[PDB]
Short mmCIF file of C-alpha atoms and ligand atoms in Angstrom, two decimals:
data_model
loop_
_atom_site.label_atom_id
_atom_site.label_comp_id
_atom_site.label_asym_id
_atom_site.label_seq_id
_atom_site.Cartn_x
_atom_site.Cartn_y
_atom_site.Cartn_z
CA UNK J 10 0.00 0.00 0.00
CA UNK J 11 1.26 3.70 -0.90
CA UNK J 12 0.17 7.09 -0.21
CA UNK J 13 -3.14 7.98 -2.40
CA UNK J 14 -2.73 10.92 -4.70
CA UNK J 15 -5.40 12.66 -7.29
CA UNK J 16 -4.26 14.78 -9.83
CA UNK J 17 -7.57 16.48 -11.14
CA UNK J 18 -7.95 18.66 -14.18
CA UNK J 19 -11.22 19.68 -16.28
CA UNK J 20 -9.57 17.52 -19.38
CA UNK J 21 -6.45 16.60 -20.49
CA UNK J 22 -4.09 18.81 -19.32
CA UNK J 23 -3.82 17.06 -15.71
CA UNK J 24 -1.59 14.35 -17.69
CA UNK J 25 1.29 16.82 -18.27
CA UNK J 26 1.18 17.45 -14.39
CA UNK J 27 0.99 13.78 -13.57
CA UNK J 28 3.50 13.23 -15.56
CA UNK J 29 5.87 14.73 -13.77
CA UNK J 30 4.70 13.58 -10.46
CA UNK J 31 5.01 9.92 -11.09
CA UNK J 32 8.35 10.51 -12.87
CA UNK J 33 9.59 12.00 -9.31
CA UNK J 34 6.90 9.55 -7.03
CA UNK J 35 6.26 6.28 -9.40
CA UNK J 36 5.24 4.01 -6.86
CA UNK J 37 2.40 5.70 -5.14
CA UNK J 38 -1.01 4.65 -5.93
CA UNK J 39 -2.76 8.10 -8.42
CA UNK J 40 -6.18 8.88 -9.38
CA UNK J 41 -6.42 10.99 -12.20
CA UNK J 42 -10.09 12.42 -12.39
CA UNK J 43 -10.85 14.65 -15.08
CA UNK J 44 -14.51 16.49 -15.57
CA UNK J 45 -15.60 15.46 -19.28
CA UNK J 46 -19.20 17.07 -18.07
CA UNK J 47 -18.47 20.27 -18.17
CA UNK J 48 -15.09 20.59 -19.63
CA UNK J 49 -14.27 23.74 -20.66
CA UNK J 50 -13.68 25.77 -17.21
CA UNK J 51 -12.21 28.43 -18.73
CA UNK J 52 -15.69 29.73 -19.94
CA UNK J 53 -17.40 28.70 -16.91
CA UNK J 54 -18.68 31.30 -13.67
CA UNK J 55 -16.16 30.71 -10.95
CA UNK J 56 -19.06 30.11 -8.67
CA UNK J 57 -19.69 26.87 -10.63
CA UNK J 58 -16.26 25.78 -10.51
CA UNK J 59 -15.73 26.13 -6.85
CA UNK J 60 -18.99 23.99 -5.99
CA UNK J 61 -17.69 21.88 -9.07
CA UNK J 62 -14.04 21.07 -7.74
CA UNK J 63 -15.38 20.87 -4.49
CA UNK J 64 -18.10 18.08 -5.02
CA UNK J 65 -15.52 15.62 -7.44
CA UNK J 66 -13.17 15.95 -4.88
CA UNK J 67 -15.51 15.18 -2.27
CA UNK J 68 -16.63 11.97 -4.72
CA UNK J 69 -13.46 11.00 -5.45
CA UNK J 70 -12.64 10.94 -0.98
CA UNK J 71 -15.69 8.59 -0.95
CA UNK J 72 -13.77 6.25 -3.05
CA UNK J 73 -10.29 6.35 -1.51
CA UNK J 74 -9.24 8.39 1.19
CA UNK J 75 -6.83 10.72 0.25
CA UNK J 76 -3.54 11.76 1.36
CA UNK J 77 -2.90 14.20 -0.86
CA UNK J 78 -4.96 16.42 -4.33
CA UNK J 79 -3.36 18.02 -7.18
CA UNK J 80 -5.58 20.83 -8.89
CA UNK J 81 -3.32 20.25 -12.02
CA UNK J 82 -5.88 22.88 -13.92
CA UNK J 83 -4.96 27.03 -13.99
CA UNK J 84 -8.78 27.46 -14.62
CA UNK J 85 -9.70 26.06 -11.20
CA UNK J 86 -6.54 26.21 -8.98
CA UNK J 87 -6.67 29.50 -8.01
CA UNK J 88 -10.36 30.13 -7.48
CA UNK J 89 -11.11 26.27 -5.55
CA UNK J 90 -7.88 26.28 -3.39
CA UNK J 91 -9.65 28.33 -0.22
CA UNK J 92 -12.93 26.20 -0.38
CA UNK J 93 -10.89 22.73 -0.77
CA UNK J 94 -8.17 23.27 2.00
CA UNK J 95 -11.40 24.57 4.24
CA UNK J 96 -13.17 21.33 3.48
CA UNK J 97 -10.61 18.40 3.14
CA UNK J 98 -7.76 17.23 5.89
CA UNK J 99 -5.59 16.18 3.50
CA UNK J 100 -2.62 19.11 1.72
CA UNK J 101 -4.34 20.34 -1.67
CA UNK J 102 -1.45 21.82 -4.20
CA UNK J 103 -2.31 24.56 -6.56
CA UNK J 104 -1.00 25.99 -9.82
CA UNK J 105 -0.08 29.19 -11.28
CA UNK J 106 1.72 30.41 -14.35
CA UNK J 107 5.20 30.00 -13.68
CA UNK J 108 5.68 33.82 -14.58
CA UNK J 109 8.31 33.95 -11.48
CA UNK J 110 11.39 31.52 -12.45
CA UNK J 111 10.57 32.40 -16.26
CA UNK J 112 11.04 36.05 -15.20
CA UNK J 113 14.50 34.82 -13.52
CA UNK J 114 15.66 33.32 -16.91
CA UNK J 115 14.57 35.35 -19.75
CA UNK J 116 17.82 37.12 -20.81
CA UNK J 117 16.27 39.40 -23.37
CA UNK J 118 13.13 40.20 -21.09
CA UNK J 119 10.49 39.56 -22.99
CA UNK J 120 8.49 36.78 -21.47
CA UNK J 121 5.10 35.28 -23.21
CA UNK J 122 2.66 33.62 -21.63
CA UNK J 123 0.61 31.68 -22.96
CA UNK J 124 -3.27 30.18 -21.61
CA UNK J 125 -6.50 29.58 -22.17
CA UNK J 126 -8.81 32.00 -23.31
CA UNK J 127 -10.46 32.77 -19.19
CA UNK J 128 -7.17 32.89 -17.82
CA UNK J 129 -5.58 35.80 -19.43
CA UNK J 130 -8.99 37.55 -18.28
CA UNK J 131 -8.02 37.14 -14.48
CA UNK J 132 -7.40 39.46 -12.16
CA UNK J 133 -5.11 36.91 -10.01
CA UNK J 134 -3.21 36.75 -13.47
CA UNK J 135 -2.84 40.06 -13.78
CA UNK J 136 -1.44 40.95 -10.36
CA UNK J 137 1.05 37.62 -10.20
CA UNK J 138 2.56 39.31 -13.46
CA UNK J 139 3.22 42.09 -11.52
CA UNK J 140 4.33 40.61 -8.02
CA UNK J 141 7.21 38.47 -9.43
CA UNK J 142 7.73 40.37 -13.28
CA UNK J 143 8.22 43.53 -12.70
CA UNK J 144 11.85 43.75 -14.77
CA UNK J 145 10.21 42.49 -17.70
CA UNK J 146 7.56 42.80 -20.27
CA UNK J 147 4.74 40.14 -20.51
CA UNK J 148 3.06 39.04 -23.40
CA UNK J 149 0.16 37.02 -22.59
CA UNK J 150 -1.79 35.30 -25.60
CA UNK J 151 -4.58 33.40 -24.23
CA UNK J 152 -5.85 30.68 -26.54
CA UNK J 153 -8.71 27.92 -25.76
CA UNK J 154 -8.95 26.67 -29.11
CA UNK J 155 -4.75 25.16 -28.16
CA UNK J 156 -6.83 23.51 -25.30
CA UNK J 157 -8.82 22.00 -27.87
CA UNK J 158 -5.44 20.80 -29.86
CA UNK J 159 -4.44 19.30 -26.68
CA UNK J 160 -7.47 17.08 -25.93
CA UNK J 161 -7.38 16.46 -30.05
CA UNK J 162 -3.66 15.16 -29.84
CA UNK J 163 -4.36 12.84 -26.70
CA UNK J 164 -7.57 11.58 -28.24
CA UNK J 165 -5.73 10.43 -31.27
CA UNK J 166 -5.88 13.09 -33.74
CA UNK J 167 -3.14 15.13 -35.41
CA UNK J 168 -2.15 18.59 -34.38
CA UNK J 169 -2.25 20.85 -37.38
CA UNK J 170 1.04 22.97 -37.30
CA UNK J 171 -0.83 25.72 -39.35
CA UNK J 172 -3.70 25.96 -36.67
CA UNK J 173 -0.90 26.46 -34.26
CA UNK J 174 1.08 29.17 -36.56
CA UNK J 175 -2.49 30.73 -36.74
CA UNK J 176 -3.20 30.92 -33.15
CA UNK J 177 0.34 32.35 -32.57
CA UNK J 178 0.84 34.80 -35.33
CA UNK J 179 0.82 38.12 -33.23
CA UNK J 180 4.20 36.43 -31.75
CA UNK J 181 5.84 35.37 -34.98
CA UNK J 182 5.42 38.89 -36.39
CA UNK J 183 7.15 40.42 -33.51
CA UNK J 184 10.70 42.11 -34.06
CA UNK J 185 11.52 40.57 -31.01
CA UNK J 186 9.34 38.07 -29.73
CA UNK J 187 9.76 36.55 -26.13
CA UNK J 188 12.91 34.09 -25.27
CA UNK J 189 11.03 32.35 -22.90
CA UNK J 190 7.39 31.15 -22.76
CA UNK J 191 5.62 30.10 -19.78
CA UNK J 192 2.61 27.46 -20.78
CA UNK J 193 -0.02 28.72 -18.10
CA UNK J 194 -2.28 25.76 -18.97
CA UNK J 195 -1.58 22.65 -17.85
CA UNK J 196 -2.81 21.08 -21.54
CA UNK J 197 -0.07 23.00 -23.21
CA UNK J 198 2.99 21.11 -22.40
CA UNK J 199 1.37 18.25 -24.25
CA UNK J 200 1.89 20.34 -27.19
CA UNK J 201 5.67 21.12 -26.44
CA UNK J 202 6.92 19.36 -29.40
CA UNK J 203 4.18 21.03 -31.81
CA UNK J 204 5.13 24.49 -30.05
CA UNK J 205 8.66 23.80 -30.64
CA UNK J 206 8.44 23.43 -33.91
CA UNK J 207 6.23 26.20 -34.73
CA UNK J 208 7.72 29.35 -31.95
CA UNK J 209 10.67 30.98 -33.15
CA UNK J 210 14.02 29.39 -32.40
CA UNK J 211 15.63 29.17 -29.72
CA UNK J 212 12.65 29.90 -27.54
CA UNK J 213 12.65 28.19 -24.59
CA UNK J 214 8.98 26.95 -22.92
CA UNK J 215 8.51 26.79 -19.11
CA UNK J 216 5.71 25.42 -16.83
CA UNK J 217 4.89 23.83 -13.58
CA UNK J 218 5.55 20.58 -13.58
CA UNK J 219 8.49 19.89 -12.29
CA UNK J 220 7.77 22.45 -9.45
CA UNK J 221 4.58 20.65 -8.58
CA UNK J 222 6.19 17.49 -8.19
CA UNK J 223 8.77 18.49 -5.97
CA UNK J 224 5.72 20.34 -3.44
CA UNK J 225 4.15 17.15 -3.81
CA UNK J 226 6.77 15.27 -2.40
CA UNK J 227 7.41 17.83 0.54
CA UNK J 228 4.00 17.77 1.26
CA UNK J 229 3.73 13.88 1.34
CA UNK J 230 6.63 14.33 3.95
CA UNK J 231 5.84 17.09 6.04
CA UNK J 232 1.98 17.18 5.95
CA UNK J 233 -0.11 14.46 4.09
CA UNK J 234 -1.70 12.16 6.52
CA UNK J 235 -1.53 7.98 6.42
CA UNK J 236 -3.81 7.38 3.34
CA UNK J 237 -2.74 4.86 1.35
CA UNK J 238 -3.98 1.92 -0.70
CA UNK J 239 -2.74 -1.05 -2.88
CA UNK J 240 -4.90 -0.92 -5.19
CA UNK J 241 -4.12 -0.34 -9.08
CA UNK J 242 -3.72 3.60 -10.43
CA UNK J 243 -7.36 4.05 -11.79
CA UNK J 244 -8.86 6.80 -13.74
CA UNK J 245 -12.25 8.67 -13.29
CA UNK J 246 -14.66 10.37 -15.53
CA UNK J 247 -17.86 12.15 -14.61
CA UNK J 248 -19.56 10.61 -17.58
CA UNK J 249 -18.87 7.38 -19.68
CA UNK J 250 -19.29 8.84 -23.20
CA UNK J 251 -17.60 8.26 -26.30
CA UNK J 252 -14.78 11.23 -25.69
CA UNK J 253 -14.12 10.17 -22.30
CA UNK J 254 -13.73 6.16 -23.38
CA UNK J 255 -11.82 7.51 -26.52
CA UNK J 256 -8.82 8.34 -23.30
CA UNK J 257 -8.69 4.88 -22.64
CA UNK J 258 -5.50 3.90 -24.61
CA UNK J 259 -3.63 6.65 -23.52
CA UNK J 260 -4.54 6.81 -20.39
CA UNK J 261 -3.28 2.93 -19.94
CA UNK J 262 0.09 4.24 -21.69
CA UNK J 263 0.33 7.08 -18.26
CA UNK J 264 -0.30 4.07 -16.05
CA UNK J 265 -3.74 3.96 -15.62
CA UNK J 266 -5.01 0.80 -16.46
CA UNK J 267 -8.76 1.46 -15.72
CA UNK J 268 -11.55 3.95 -16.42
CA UNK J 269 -14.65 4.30 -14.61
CA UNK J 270 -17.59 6.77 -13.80
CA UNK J 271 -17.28 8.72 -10.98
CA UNK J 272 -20.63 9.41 -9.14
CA UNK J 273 -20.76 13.26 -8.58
CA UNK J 274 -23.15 15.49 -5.97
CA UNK J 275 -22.56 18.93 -7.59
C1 UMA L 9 8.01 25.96 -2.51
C2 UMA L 9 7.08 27.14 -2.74
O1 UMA L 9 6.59 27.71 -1.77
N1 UMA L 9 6.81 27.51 -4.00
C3 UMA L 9 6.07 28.75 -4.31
C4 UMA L 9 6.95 29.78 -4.99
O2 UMA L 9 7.44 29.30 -6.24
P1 UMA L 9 8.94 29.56 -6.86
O3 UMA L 9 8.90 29.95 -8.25
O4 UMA L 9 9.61 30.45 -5.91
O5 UMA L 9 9.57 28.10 -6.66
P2 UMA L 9 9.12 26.62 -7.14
O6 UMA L 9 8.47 25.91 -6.03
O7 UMA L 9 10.14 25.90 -7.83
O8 UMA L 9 7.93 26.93 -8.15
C5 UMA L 9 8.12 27.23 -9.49
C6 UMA L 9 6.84 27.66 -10.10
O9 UMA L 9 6.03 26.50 -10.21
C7 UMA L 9 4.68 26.77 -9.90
N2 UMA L 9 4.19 26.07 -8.66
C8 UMA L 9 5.06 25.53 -7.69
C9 UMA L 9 4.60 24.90 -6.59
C10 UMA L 9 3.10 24.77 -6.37
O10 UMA L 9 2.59 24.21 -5.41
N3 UMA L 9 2.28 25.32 -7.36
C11 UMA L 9 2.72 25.97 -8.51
O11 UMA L 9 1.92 26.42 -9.32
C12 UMA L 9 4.69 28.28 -9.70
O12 UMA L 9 4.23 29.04 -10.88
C13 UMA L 9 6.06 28.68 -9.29
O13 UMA L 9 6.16 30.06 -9.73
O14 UMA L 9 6.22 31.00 -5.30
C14 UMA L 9 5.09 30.79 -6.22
C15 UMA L 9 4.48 32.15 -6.47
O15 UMA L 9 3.93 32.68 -5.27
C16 UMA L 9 4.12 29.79 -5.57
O16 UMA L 9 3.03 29.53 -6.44
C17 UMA L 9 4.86 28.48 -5.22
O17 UMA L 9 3.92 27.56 -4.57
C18 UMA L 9 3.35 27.63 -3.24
C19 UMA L 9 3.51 26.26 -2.57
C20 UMA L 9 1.99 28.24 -3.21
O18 UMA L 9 1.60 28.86 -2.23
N4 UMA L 9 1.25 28.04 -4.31
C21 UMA L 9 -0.16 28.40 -4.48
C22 UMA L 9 -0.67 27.88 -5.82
C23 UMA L 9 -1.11 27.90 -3.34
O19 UMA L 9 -0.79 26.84 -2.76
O20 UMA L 9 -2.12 28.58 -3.04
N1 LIG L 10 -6.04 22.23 -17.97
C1 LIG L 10 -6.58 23.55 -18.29
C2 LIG L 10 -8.12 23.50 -18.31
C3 LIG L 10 -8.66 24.24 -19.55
C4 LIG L 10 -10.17 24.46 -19.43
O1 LIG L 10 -10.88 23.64 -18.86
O2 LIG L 10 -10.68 25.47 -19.92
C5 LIG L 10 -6.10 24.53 -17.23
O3 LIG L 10 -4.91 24.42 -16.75
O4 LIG L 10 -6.86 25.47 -16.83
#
C-alpha cells in the first residue's frame, strides 16, 4: 500500500502534471479524475467551478481516502484552493503560471505567456505578473482553441502545425518576440513538441511541472496524513461517453489501467 494521490484537471491537461509527479513519485497509488461534463472551465462562472471542484473531490474521498490532491488545472486552482483546504484534511497543491522563475531566466526580457482563453482575463493573473515580473515585459496570448489541440492530440488526432502558426501569429510577427514562454495551462505542455516546432528558435517553454512534483513530495513528507492503498492507479470520468472512453489507450500508456464513472453530488 502507498500514499493515495489525485491529480484532477477539467480535461487533459492534468496528464502533463501527472506526468511529472510519477516521474519523481512512481510508486504511489494516483487517481487521475478529469470532468468530461463540463469541460471547458475556462468559460465557466467561478461560482460553478468552486462547488464543481469541491463536489468531485468530495466523490473521489468517498472512493479512496486521500492523502494528498493536485488541482493540475490554472482554470480552477486558483479560485477552488480556499474552499478545498477549508473542506478536506488532506494538503491540496495549486498551480499558477510559472511567470516567477521564467522572469529569472529570460535574458532578453520579454516573457510570453501563454493560456486559455479565461485565464488571461483574471485578475489573479494580472497581479502575479506584476508581483514576481516587474523587470520584464509580458506578453500574454490566451488561446482555448490550443486547449482543444491538446485534448485532439491525446484523443488520437493530429495537431495541425498551421492551426498552431495561426493561433500564434501576433508572436511570430514580432521584431523581437519573447525568449522564454511560460505554458499557463496545464494542456499545453502536451503540445511542447508542436510548439517547438512552430515558436521561433531558440525559444525556450517553461511550466509547472516539475515544481509541482517536488511540493508534492514535501507535502507527502511534512503534511499528508496515512492514506494509502494497494490498489491499481485508476482513472475517473464524470460521464462514460464516447470522448471520455476515446482516453482509454492513452490513459493505460500514463499508467492507468482502468476507467470508470465517478458518481458526482454537484
Ligand atoms: C516551494 C514554494 O513555496 N513555491 C512557491 C513559490 O514558487 P517559486 O517559483 O519560488 O519556486 P518553485 O516551487 O520551484 O515553483 C516554481 C513555479 O512553479 C509553480 N508552482 C510551484 C509549486 C506549487 O505548489 N504550485 C505551482 O503552481 C509556480 O508558478 C512557481 O512560480 O512561489 C510561487 C508564487 O507565489 C508559488 O506559487 C509556489 O507555490 C506555493 C507552494 C503556493 O503557495 N502556491 C499556491 C498555488 C497555493 O498553494 O495557493
Ligand atoms: N487544464 C486547463 C483547463 C482548460 C479548461 O478547462 O478550460 C487549465 O490548466 O486550466
Amino acid at each position: 500500500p502507498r500514499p493515495t494521490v489525485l491529480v484532477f484537471d477539467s480535461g487533459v491537461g492534468g496528464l502533463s502534471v501527472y506526468d511529472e509527479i510519477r516521474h519523481l513519485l512512481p510508486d504511489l497509488h494516483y487517481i487521475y479524475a478529469f470532468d468530461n461534463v463540463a469541460f471547458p472551465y475556462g468559460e465557466k462562472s467561478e461560482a460553478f467551478i468552486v462547488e464543481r471542484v469541491v463536489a468531485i473531490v468530495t466523490a473521489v474521498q468517498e472512493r479512496y481516502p486521500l492523502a494528498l490532491a493536485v488541482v493540475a488545472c490554472n482554470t480552477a486552482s486558483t479560485v477552488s484552493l480556499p474552499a478545498l483546504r477549508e473542506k478536506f484534511d488532506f494538503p491540496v497543491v495549486g498551480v499558477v503560471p510559472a511567470i516567477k522563475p521564467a522572469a529569472r531566466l529570460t535574458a532578453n526580457g520579454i516573457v510570453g505567456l501563454l493560456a486559455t482563453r479565461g485565464t488571461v482575463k483574471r485578475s489573479y493573473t494580472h497581479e502575479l505578473i506584476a508581483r514576481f515580473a516587474n523587470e520584464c515585459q509580458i506578453e500574454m496570448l490566451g488561446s482555448a482553441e490550443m486547449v482543444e489541440l491538446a485534448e485532439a492530440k491525446l484523443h488520437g488526432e493530429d495537431v495541425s502545425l498551421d492551426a498552431l502558426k495561426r493561433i500564434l501569429r501576433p508572436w511570430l510577427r514580432m521584431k523581437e518576440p519573447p525568449d522564454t514562454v511560460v505554458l499557463g495551462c496545464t494542456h499545453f505542455p502536451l503540445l511542447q513538441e508542436e510548439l517547438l516546432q512552430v515558436l521561433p528558435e531558440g525559444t525556450r517553454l517553461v511550466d509547472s511541472g516539475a515544481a509541482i512534483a517536488r511540493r508534492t513530495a514535501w507535502l507527502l513528507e511534512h503534511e499528508a496524513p496515512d492514506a494509502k492503498s494497494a490498489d491499481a492507479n485508476i482513472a475517473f470520468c464524470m460521464a462514460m461517453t464516447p470522448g471520455a472512453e476515446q482516453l482509454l489507450p492513452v490513459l493505460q500508456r500514463y499508467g492507468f489501467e482502468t476507467l470508470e464513472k465517478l458518481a458526482v453530488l454537484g
